[PDB]
RNA sequence: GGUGACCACGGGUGACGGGGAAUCAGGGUUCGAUUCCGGAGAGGGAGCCUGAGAAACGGCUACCACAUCCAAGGAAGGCAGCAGGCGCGCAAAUUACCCACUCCCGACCCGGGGAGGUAGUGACGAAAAAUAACAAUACAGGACUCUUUCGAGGCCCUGUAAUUGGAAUGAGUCCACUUUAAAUCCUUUAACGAGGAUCCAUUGGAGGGCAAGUCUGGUGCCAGCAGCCGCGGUAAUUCCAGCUCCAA
């Protein structure tokens, strides 16, 4: 009677034990030195890491020579190297377990723009991302949690419409410019 | 028009529907969404066709402006177009009239003429006095 | 009833009425997540005090 | 010890389902009689009409009176006493009006110094008690 | 300060986070003393106390605002008795206590200058 | 004769079954009225005509139970269909538009379709993500710190955080375009649109578990708090207030 999907899931996992000093300080350093909004983002990214760890664990507990094991291991490796979280020289599944959260956070476009130095003060970089002044390879994207792929790391440039790529200066520019032309002549 | 271009893809020819089907995408870097009429004009001029048998709709823009993609519909004759083409597009650029009462008045009229039986005079008379 | 219910809210009756004075609107969101982190992690006070507060009135 | 044959699942299952009852929680959940003894009929909150404002003293190590109220339910109109937790809400509530009495919080069981009451009063006539206390919304005089 | 600028410049690598005495607690009156030298200290045997000139400052302060001891005590969130002592002149002066008294009172008894016609400037400069 | 302690029979079931849902070391435990499938019902029974197919109910007949109009002589009912009412309750949306899509029905390009689609209501729920950034101003206040005051930075606190101080902006009016059956929205996109950028984030705590107050002022086993330990009779770290910290 309805042509809808209902296909949805939570993108994050809550902490089991609330109010531990150590975890609180850990997430606080991660967010603050990573310029996140709230620790829901930290939970989501750690949840993604946990899911991939779960898949890798299942794959390792599966015997070698399994066509599905080989196929899925290679697929996981290729998608990680395509992401950039994996070095091309480490194609072994156990290495995936040794991976940690912070480098997955590095692949966030909000961090990558600051790393490229295109937008300083990583909080300012993220605010500029929300200000959609960047432009991806063929598009203008406003998503701080955007993950870059290896091919697109070098495809990050300011949007033409922003007063940082092409022209078209902003509305405070227009206002104060007309103000100056109305005050002097 | 100074910097506005049109590109076409997945372009195929056919004759049983006496038309050619392709998907078209339009670039307008610092411009709003492009009205359909001059796209019709551009495709007519670049396809050496009359600017009247081209029908276009479903125009949506990729995020951030510039690229805008949609479906283009070129026939060979507005005659065969009239034969096989949905009416509401002809309603958009007015060639086919479309003006009727809503389905509610239609249905109540239907029930009214259903109430009376047999007699043509009263059946059509169910719309004369009961309007 | 014993009628000793006359004292309901008595302390609410007796409390003096002092209000919320104006104060600069605190930042929210990532801005709120910024400055306490700045105040809690990268800060090296040159005094002792047996690991006091960030609200430090030791 | 315990049975450990391979062709014995029936004995194990029957014995476990026998011994399953001897815990309070499952028995009260599956007997049915506990659901019937629950005035709420299993609901989380209930509509009720206020009958009389009662003050009941607390236990011995504490020294106070507690402003509660005997409330008549609408469904299956038995009478139950519901506590109102706040400084002066007892004055906010008057006689003979609707109240969305909810559970006290610990599954049909007395709480704290209060003896014998398992119900707290919230949502008096449609404005919520908390909104009255904070003055967020007032009485609809 | 320079080191934060360098750490920003150290976007590529490095950088350490170390916390502080701080990060979570609340204590609500400050020891001005290091509490460590006092432990190491055995030689000196005297505590300065506060100058009565400051007490005069507080008194004229209160009068010009016209608040009793108790009212300013409620304001600074401390006992009336600590105010009464600080006017009396014993006071074993505490930097944060007299600092909050400075924030309350127009005069800047805090600092080397005994008083300021306005503490740190009117509407803070 | 048949079945039965391998639980027959009987009783309850707040039982429509299954695909599956929640939880997740494994094992298991609960939930599946509900869009898919099957079954059943169309107020409760009962009997039928036609029809290939009905024990049909937006078909008929009888009874019961409700229940409409009635010149009192009769006639007509079945929303567990779409809405939408009443009632019932803690608890549940609009008596909106459209056959354009999906498919169905019919003699059939051409008609119909409260199927269905669109919109409205909609902190059920889930995804993303606003509530500020940049730079300098710098200046003060500290047991600051490094020479022993003078100078600087290897630091903290607030404050001009202020002409900063001009840069970029969305939240909103708001051009058309787009979209769409027609609209709506989102996406484009001009004109406006931010310095307490007052265009304002709240909800609960701050003795233990459990993160956070030996603050102050009130109250004085009182009010009250308190999931549980317990707190509260004058000096309350537990109530009521202001301040400040913690939590999401
Ligand atoms: Mg069910
Ligand atoms: Mg079904
Ligand atoms: Mg037939
Ligand atoms: Mg039937
Ligand atoms: Mg039937
Ligand atoms: Mg805001
Ligand atoms: Mg507190």
PDB file of N, CA and C in Angstrom, chain D residues 25-65:
ATOM      1  N   UNK D  25      10.220 -12.551  38.798  1.00  0.00           N
ATOM      2  CA  UNK D  25       9.979 -11.695  37.643  1.00  0.00           C
ATOM      3  C   UNK D  25       9.210 -12.435  36.560  1.00  0.00           C
ATOM      4  N   UNK D  26       9.700 -13.608  36.160  1.00  0.00           N
ATOM      5  CA  UNK D  26       9.037 -14.346  35.092  1.00  0.00           C
ATOM      6  C   UNK D  26       7.646 -14.790  35.512  1.00  0.00           C
ATOM      7  N   UNK D  27       7.494 -15.211  36.766  1.00  0.00           N
ATOM      8  CA  UNK D  27       6.189 -15.649  37.238  1.00  0.00           C
ATOM      9  C   UNK D  27       5.181 -14.516  37.164  1.00  0.00           C
ATOM     10  N   UNK D  28       5.535 -13.353  37.710  1.00  0.00           N
ATOM     11  CA  UNK D  28       4.620 -12.221  37.659  1.00  0.00           C
ATOM     12  C   UNK D  28       4.407 -11.747  36.230  1.00  0.00           C
ATOM     13  N   UNK D  29       5.358 -12.016  35.337  1.00  0.00           N
ATOM     14  CA  UNK D  29       5.177 -11.617  33.948  1.00  0.00           C
ATOM     15  C   UNK D  29       4.228 -12.551  33.207  1.00  0.00           C
ATOM     16  N   UNK D  30       4.253 -13.845  33.526  1.00  0.00           N
ATOM     17  CA  UNK D  30       3.552 -14.832  32.716  1.00  0.00           C
ATOM     18  C   UNK D  30       2.375 -15.491  33.415  1.00  0.00           C
ATOM     19  N   UNK D  31       2.221 -15.308  34.724  1.00  0.00           N
ATOM     20  CA  UNK D  31       1.055 -15.873  35.390  1.00  0.00           C
ATOM     21  C   UNK D  31      -0.229 -15.230  34.888  1.00  0.00           C
ATOM     22  N   UNK D  32      -0.217 -13.915  34.707  1.00  0.00           N
ATOM     23  CA  UNK D  32      -1.416 -13.196  34.333  1.00  0.00           C
ATOM     24  C   UNK D  32      -2.021 -12.473  35.516  1.00  0.00           C
ATOM     25  N   UNK D  33      -1.982 -13.114  36.687  1.00  0.00           N
ATOM     26  CA  UNK D  33      -2.592 -12.524  37.872  1.00  0.00           C
ATOM     27  C   UNK D  33      -1.916 -11.220  38.270  1.00  0.00           C
ATOM     28  N   UNK D  34      -0.606 -11.101  38.050  1.00  0.00           N
ATOM     29  CA  UNK D  34       0.076  -9.856  38.377  1.00  0.00           C
ATOM     30  C   UNK D  34      -0.406  -8.720  37.488  1.00  0.00           C
ATOM     31  N   UNK D  35      -0.634  -9.007  36.205  1.00  0.00           N
ATOM     32  CA  UNK D  35      -1.182  -7.995  35.312  1.00  0.00           C
ATOM     33  C   UNK D  35      -2.554  -7.536  35.787  1.00  0.00           C
ATOM     34  N   UNK D  36      -3.357  -8.456  36.324  1.00  0.00           N
ATOM     35  CA  UNK D  36      -4.684  -8.086  36.806  1.00  0.00           C
ATOM     36  C   UNK D  36      -4.601  -7.323  38.123  1.00  0.00           C
ATOM     37  N   UNK D  37      -3.613  -7.649  38.953  1.00  0.00           N
ATOM     38  CA  UNK D  37      -3.402  -6.912  40.188  1.00  0.00           C
ATOM     39  C   UNK D  37      -2.870  -5.513  39.937  1.00  0.00           C
ATOM     40  N   UNK D  38      -2.209  -5.292  38.817  1.00  0.00           N
ATOM     41  CA  UNK D  38      -1.701  -3.965  38.513  1.00  0.00           C
ATOM     42  C   UNK D  38      -2.866  -3.038  38.199  1.00  0.00           C
ATOM     43  N   UNK D  39      -3.067  -1.965  38.962  1.00  0.00           N
ATOM     44  CA  UNK D  39      -4.188  -1.064  38.665  1.00  0.00           C
ATOM     45  C   UNK D  39      -4.103  -0.448  37.287  1.00  0.00           C
ATOM     46  N   UNK D  40      -2.897  -0.201  36.787  1.00  0.00           N
ATOM     47  CA  UNK D  40      -2.744   0.397  35.470  1.00  0.00           C
ATOM     48  C   UNK D  40      -3.118  -0.557  34.348  1.00  0.00           C
ATOM     49  N   UNK D  41      -3.341  -1.831  34.655  1.00  0.00           N
ATOM     50  CA  UNK D  41      -3.624  -2.794  33.607  1.00  0.00           C
ATOM     51  C   UNK D  41      -2.469  -2.961  32.649  1.00  0.00           C
ATOM     52  N   UNK D  42      -1.253  -2.676  33.110  1.00  0.00           N
ATOM     53  CA  UNK D  42      -0.075  -2.742  32.279  1.00  0.00           C
ATOM     54  C   UNK D  42       0.306  -1.444  31.604  1.00  0.00           C
ATOM     55  N   UNK D  43      -0.547  -0.428  31.660  1.00  0.00           N
ATOM     56  CA  UNK D  43      -0.215   0.842  31.046  1.00  0.00           C
ATOM     57  C   UNK D  43       0.917   1.517  31.811  1.00  0.00           C
ATOM     58  N   UNK D  44       1.570   2.470  31.151  1.00  0.00           N
ATOM     59  CA  UNK D  44       2.634   3.230  31.787  1.00  0.00           C
ATOM     60  C   UNK D  44       2.123   4.412  32.589  1.00  0.00           C
ATOM     61  N   UNK D  45       1.156   5.148  32.058  1.00  0.00           N
ATOM     62  CA  UNK D  45       0.500   6.215  32.790  1.00  0.00           C
ATOM     63  C   UNK D  45      -0.987   5.913  32.800  1.00  0.00           C
ATOM     64  N   UNK D  46      -1.747   6.702  33.547  1.00  0.00           N
ATOM     65  CA  UNK D  46      -3.183   6.482  33.595  1.00  0.00           C
ATOM     66  C   UNK D  46      -3.898   7.787  33.894  1.00  0.00           C
ATOM     67  N   UNK D  47      -5.091   7.941  33.329  1.00  0.00           N
ATOM     68  CA  UNK D  47      -5.950   9.052  33.697  1.00  0.00           C
ATOM     69  C   UNK D  47      -6.668   8.728  34.996  1.00  0.00           C
ATOM     70  N   UNK D  48      -6.767   9.725  35.870  1.00  0.00           N
ATOM     71  CA  UNK D  48      -7.451   9.550  37.134  1.00  0.00           C
ATOM     72  C   UNK D  48      -8.037  10.864  37.599  1.00  0.00           C
ATOM     73  N   UNK D  49      -9.033  10.763  38.473  1.00  0.00           N
ATOM     74  CA  UNK D  49      -9.719  11.931  39.004  1.00  0.00           C
ATOM     75  C   UNK D  49      -9.380  12.052  40.481  1.00  0.00           C
ATOM     76  N   UNK D  50      -9.118  13.282  40.919  1.00  0.00           N
ATOM     77  CA  UNK D  50      -8.608  13.507  42.262  1.00  0.00           C
ATOM     78  C   UNK D  50      -9.760  13.463  43.251  1.00  0.00           C
ATOM     79  N   UNK D  51      -9.574  12.719  44.334  1.00  0.00           N
ATOM     80  CA  UNK D  51     -10.613  12.536  45.334  1.00  0.00           C
ATOM     81  C   UNK D  51     -10.324  13.289  46.622  1.00  0.00           C
ATOM     82  N   UNK D  52      -9.110  13.186  47.151  1.00  0.00           N
ATOM     83  CA  UNK D  52      -8.817  13.815  48.433  1.00  0.00           C
ATOM     84  C   UNK D  52      -7.305  13.946  48.548  1.00  0.00           C
ATOM     85  N   UNK D  53      -6.837  15.051  49.122  1.00  0.00           N
ATOM     86  CA  UNK D  53      -5.409  15.247  49.341  1.00  0.00           C
ATOM     87  C   UNK D  53      -5.004  14.686  50.706  1.00  0.00           C
ATOM     88  N   UNK D  54      -4.119  13.673  50.715  1.00  0.00           N
ATOM     89  CA  UNK D  54      -3.683  12.988  51.934  1.00  0.00           C
ATOM     90  C   UNK D  54      -2.242  13.361  52.262  1.00  0.00           C
ATOM     91  N   UNK D  55      -1.973  13.527  53.557  1.00  0.00           N
ATOM     92  CA  UNK D  55      -0.604  13.589  54.038  1.00  0.00           C
ATOM     93  C   UNK D  55      -0.183  12.362  54.828  1.00  0.00           C
ATOM     94  N   UNK D  56       0.839  11.649  54.357  1.00  0.00           N
ATOM     95  CA  UNK D  56       1.333  10.442  55.011  1.00  0.00           C
ATOM     96  C   UNK D  56       2.758  10.689  55.483  1.00  0.00           C
ATOM     97  N   UNK D  57       3.043  10.293  56.718  1.00  0.00           N
ATOM     98  CA  UNK D  57       4.382  10.440  57.265  1.00  0.00           C
ATOM     99  C   UNK D  57       5.331   9.424  56.641  1.00  0.00           C
ATOM    100  N   UNK D  58       6.625   9.716  56.729  1.00  0.00           N
ATOM    101  CA  UNK D  58       7.650   8.849  56.167  1.00  0.00           C
ATOM    102  C   UNK D  58       8.076   7.815  57.208  1.00  0.00           C
ATOM    103  N   UNK D  59       9.193   7.138  56.956  1.00  0.00           N
ATOM    104  CA  UNK D  59       9.704   6.131  57.874  1.00  0.00           C
ATOM    105  C   UNK D  59      10.252   6.792  59.140  1.00  0.00           C
ATOM    106  N   UNK D  60      10.861   5.985  60.008  1.00  0.00           N
ATOM    107  CA  UNK D  60      11.374   6.522  61.267  1.00  0.00           C
ATOM    108  C   UNK D  60      12.661   7.319  61.102  1.00  0.00           C
ATOM    109  N   UNK D  61      13.727   6.807  60.472  1.00  0.00           N
ATOM    110  CA  UNK D  61      14.970   7.594  60.425  1.00  0.00           C
ATOM    111  C   UNK D  61      14.795   8.931  59.739  1.00  0.00           C
ATOM    112  N   UNK D  62      13.760   9.078  58.924  1.00  0.00           N
ATOM    113  CA  UNK D  62      13.355  10.363  58.382  1.00  0.00           C
ATOM    114  C   UNK D  62      12.214  10.938  59.214  1.00  0.00           C
ATOM    115  N   UNK D  63      12.083  12.262  59.174  1.00  0.00           N
ATOM    116  CA  UNK D  63      11.052  12.965  59.941  1.00  0.00           C
ATOM    117  C   UNK D  63      10.435  14.015  59.025  1.00  0.00           C
ATOM    118  N   UNK D  64       9.244  13.713  58.519  1.00  0.00           N
ATOM    119  CA  UNK D  64       8.519  14.625  57.649  1.00  0.00           C
ATOM    120  C   UNK D  64       7.143  14.046  57.380  1.00  0.00           C
ATOM    121  N   UNK D  65       6.280  14.879  56.822  1.00  0.00           N
ATOM    122  CA  UNK D  65       5.037  14.425  56.225  1.00  0.00           C
ATOM    123  C   UNK D  65       5.186  14.562  54.722  1.00  0.00           C
TER     124      UNK D  65
END
